[PDB]
Amino acid sequence: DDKVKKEVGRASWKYFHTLLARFPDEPTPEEREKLHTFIGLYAELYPCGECSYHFVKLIEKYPVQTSSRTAAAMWGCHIHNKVNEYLKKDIYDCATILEDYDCGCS
Protein backbone atom coordinates (compact mmCIF):
# COMPACT_ATOMS: atom_id res chain seq x y z
CA ASP A 1 0.00 0.00 0.00
CA ASP A 2 1.19 3.55 0.67
CA LYS A 3 3.65 2.06 3.17
CA VAL A 4 5.45 -0.16 0.67
CA LYS A 5 5.68 2.63 -1.89
CA LYS A 6 7.28 4.88 0.72
CA GLU A 7 9.78 2.34 2.05
CA VAL A 8 10.87 1.23 -1.41
CA GLY A 9 11.07 4.83 -2.64
CA ARG A 10 13.39 5.93 0.18
CA ALA A 11 15.77 3.02 -0.43
CA SER A 12 15.71 3.60 -4.18
CA TRP A 13 16.52 7.31 -3.89
CA LYS A 14 19.42 6.54 -1.55
CA TYR A 15 20.92 4.13 -4.09
CA PHE A 16 19.94 6.42 -7.01
CA HIS A 17 21.74 9.55 -5.76
CA THR A 18 24.79 7.61 -4.57
CA LEU A 19 25.13 5.97 -7.98
CA LEU A 20 25.05 9.37 -9.71
CA ALA A 21 27.57 10.87 -7.29
CA ARG A 22 30.05 8.25 -8.49
CA PHE A 23 29.65 9.02 -12.20
CA PRO A 24 33.02 10.26 -13.57
CA ASP A 25 33.99 13.92 -13.99
CA GLU A 26 35.10 13.28 -17.58
CA PRO A 27 32.78 10.51 -18.84
CA THR A 28 33.63 8.92 -22.17
CA PRO A 29 30.98 8.87 -24.93
CA GLU A 30 30.32 5.24 -23.96
CA GLU A 31 29.86 6.03 -20.26
CA ARG A 32 27.50 8.87 -21.13
CA GLU A 33 25.66 6.38 -23.33
CA LYS A 34 25.48 3.80 -20.53
CA LEU A 35 24.17 6.21 -17.91
CA HIS A 36 21.54 7.30 -20.44
CA THR A 37 20.44 3.71 -21.06
CA PHE A 38 20.52 2.88 -17.33
CA ILE A 39 18.21 5.78 -16.51
CA GLY A 40 15.73 4.73 -19.18
CA LEU A 41 15.66 1.17 -17.82
CA TYR A 42 15.64 2.42 -14.22
CA ALA A 43 12.47 4.38 -15.01
CA GLU A 44 10.79 1.68 -17.08
CA LEU A 45 11.49 -1.10 -14.54
CA TYR A 46 10.74 0.89 -11.37
CA PRO A 47 8.70 -1.31 -8.88
CA CYS A 48 5.53 0.83 -8.75
CA GLY A 49 2.98 1.31 -11.52
CA GLU A 50 2.04 4.97 -11.20
CA CYS A 51 5.59 5.88 -10.17
CA SER A 52 7.09 4.37 -13.34
CA TYR A 53 4.33 5.98 -15.41
CA HIS A 54 5.21 9.45 -14.09
CA PHE A 55 8.95 8.88 -13.98
CA VAL A 56 9.27 7.69 -17.59
CA LYS A 57 7.63 10.91 -18.77
CA LEU A 58 9.82 12.99 -16.47
CA ILE A 59 13.15 11.62 -17.73
CA GLU A 60 12.02 12.06 -21.34
CA LYS A 61 10.90 15.62 -20.58
CA TYR A 62 14.14 16.33 -18.68
CA PRO A 63 16.80 13.90 -20.03
CA VAL A 64 19.67 12.91 -17.75
CA GLN A 65 22.59 15.35 -17.96
CA THR A 66 25.64 13.15 -18.55
CA SER A 67 28.38 15.66 -19.42
CA SER A 68 29.93 15.18 -15.97
CA ARG A 69 29.61 13.90 -12.42
CA THR A 70 28.33 17.26 -11.17
CA ALA A 71 25.86 17.59 -14.04
CA ALA A 72 24.53 14.07 -13.42
CA ALA A 73 24.20 14.20 -9.63
CA MET A 74 22.66 17.66 -9.95
CA TRP A 75 20.22 16.31 -12.54
CA GLY A 76 19.35 13.59 -10.03
CA CYS A 77 18.56 16.18 -7.37
CA HIS A 78 16.48 18.18 -9.87
CA ILE A 79 14.58 15.12 -11.10
CA HIS A 80 13.88 13.99 -7.53
CA ASN A 81 12.62 17.51 -6.82
CA LYS A 82 10.22 17.16 -9.75
CA VAL A 83 8.75 14.13 -7.98
CA ASN A 84 8.65 16.06 -4.70
CA GLU A 85 6.87 18.92 -6.45
CA TYR A 86 4.41 16.42 -7.89
CA LEU A 87 3.73 14.84 -4.49
CA LYS A 88 3.52 18.26 -2.81
CA LYS A 89 6.62 17.51 -0.74
CA ASP A 90 9.34 20.00 0.19
CA ILE A 91 12.01 20.93 -2.35
CA TYR A 92 15.48 19.67 -1.37
CA ASP A 93 18.48 22.05 -1.39
CA CYS A 94 20.86 20.66 -4.06
CA ALA A 95 23.87 22.68 -2.83
CA THR A 96 25.69 19.68 -1.34
CA ILE A 97 24.29 16.94 -3.58
CA LEU A 98 27.61 15.07 -3.90
CA GLU A 99 28.58 15.33 -0.21
CA ASP A 100 25.08 14.19 0.81
CA TYR A 101 25.64 10.86 -0.95
CA ASP A 102 29.21 9.70 -0.45
CA CYS A 103 29.71 6.10 -1.56
CA GLY A 104 31.52 5.30 1.68
CA CYS A 105 33.76 3.40 -0.73
CA SER A 106 37.41 3.42 -1.80
Add this chain to the structure above:
Amino acid sequence: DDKVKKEVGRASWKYFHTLLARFPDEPTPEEREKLHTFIGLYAELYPCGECSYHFVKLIEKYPVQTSSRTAAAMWGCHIHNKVNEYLKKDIYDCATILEDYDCGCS
Protein backbone atom coordinates in the same frame (compact mmCIF):
# COMPACT_ATOMS: atom_id res chain seq x y z
CA ASP B 1 33.06 5.16 6.09
CA ASP B 2 32.23 1.46 6.15
CA LYS B 3 28.90 2.24 7.80
CA VAL B 4 27.94 4.34 4.78
CA LYS B 5 28.78 1.54 2.36
CA LYS B 6 26.63 -0.83 4.41
CA GLU B 7 23.73 1.64 4.41
CA VAL B 8 24.04 2.10 0.65
CA GLY B 9 24.15 -1.67 0.29
CA ARG B 10 21.01 -2.27 2.33
CA ALA B 11 19.13 0.37 0.33
CA SER B 12 20.30 -1.12 -2.98
CA TRP B 13 19.21 -4.68 -2.08
CA LYS B 14 15.81 -3.44 -0.92
CA TYR B 15 15.29 -1.73 -4.31
CA PHE B 16 16.84 -4.64 -6.25
CA HIS B 17 14.70 -7.41 -4.75
CA THR B 18 11.52 -5.35 -5.02
CA LEU B 19 12.22 -4.63 -8.68
CA LEU B 20 12.66 -8.34 -9.41
CA ALA B 21 9.51 -9.21 -7.45
CA ARG B 22 7.51 -6.73 -9.57
CA PHE B 23 8.69 -8.08 -12.94
CA PRO B 24 5.86 -9.65 -15.02
CA ASP B 25 4.88 -13.31 -14.59
CA GLU B 26 4.61 -13.48 -18.39
CA PRO B 27 7.23 -11.04 -19.74
CA THR B 28 7.47 -10.30 -23.45
CA PRO B 29 10.76 -10.99 -25.24
CA GLU B 30 11.54 -7.26 -25.09
CA GLU B 31 10.91 -7.01 -21.34
CA ARG B 32 13.17 -10.02 -20.82
CA GLU B 33 16.00 -8.32 -22.72
CA LYS B 34 15.49 -5.03 -20.90
CA LEU B 35 15.92 -6.85 -17.58
CA HIS B 36 19.05 -8.61 -18.85
CA THR B 37 20.50 -5.28 -19.99
CA PHE B 38 19.44 -3.50 -16.79
CA ILE B 39 21.19 -6.04 -14.58
CA GLY B 40 24.36 -5.63 -16.60
CA LEU B 41 24.38 -1.86 -16.09
CA TYR B 42 23.29 -2.21 -12.45
CA ALA B 43 26.37 -4.35 -11.76
CA GLU B 44 28.63 -2.15 -13.86
CA LEU B 45 27.41 1.07 -12.20
CA TYR B 46 27.27 -0.05 -8.55
CA PRO B 47 28.66 2.68 -6.14
CA CYS B 48 31.80 0.83 -4.97
CA GLY B 49 34.71 -0.30 -7.15
CA GLU B 50 35.45 -3.61 -5.45
CA CYS B 51 31.76 -4.44 -5.06
CA SER B 52 31.06 -3.74 -8.73
CA TYR B 53 34.07 -5.73 -9.87
CA HIS B 54 32.94 -8.82 -7.99
CA PHE B 55 29.25 -8.38 -8.82
CA VAL B 56 29.92 -8.08 -12.55
CA LYS B 57 31.81 -11.38 -12.40
CA LEU B 58 28.88 -12.95 -10.54
CA ILE B 59 26.17 -11.89 -13.00
CA GLU B 60 28.32 -13.22 -15.83
CA LYS B 61 28.83 -16.50 -13.97
CA TYR B 62 25.14 -16.60 -13.06
CA PRO B 63 23.21 -14.70 -15.77
CA VAL B 64 19.84 -13.30 -14.73
CA GLN B 65 16.85 -15.62 -15.20
CA THR B 66 14.21 -13.53 -16.98
CA SER B 67 11.53 -16.03 -18.04
CA SER B 68 9.23 -14.83 -15.26
CA ARG B 69 8.82 -12.84 -12.07
CA THR B 70 9.51 -15.96 -9.98
CA ALA B 71 12.62 -16.97 -11.93
CA ALA B 72 13.98 -13.41 -11.71
CA ALA B 73 13.15 -13.07 -8.00
CA MET B 74 14.66 -16.49 -7.23
CA TRP B 75 17.78 -15.53 -9.18
CA GLY B 76 18.04 -12.32 -7.18
CA CYS B 77 17.94 -14.20 -3.90
CA HIS B 78 20.61 -16.69 -4.99
CA ILE B 79 22.82 -13.89 -6.32
CA HIS B 80 22.50 -11.96 -3.06
CA ASN B 81 23.40 -15.18 -1.21
CA LYS B 82 26.51 -15.42 -3.39
CA VAL B 83 27.49 -11.99 -2.07
CA ASN B 84 26.59 -13.09 1.45
CA GLU B 85 28.76 -16.19 1.13
CA TYR B 86 31.54 -13.98 -0.22
CA LEU B 87 31.39 -11.65 2.79
CA LYS B 88 31.03 -14.70 5.05
CA LYS B 89 27.49 -13.70 6.05
CA ASP B 90 24.65 -16.16 6.75
CA ILE B 91 22.59 -17.62 3.93
CA TYR B 92 19.08 -16.25 3.40
CA ASP B 93 16.20 -18.68 2.85
CA CYS B 94 14.57 -17.92 -0.52
CA ALA B 95 11.35 -19.84 0.22
CA THR B 96 9.22 -16.66 0.34
CA ILE B 97 11.32 -14.31 -1.81
CA LEU B 98 8.31 -12.83 -3.63
CA GLU B 99 6.28 -12.21 -0.46
CA ASP B 100 9.30 -10.81 1.40
CA TYR B 101 9.46 -8.00 -1.14
CA ASP B 102 5.83 -7.09 -1.69
CA CYS B 103 5.30 -8.74 -5.07
CA GLY B 104 1.60 -7.97 -4.74
CA CYS B 105 1.14 -11.38 -6.31
CA SER B 106 -0.10 -13.72 -3.56
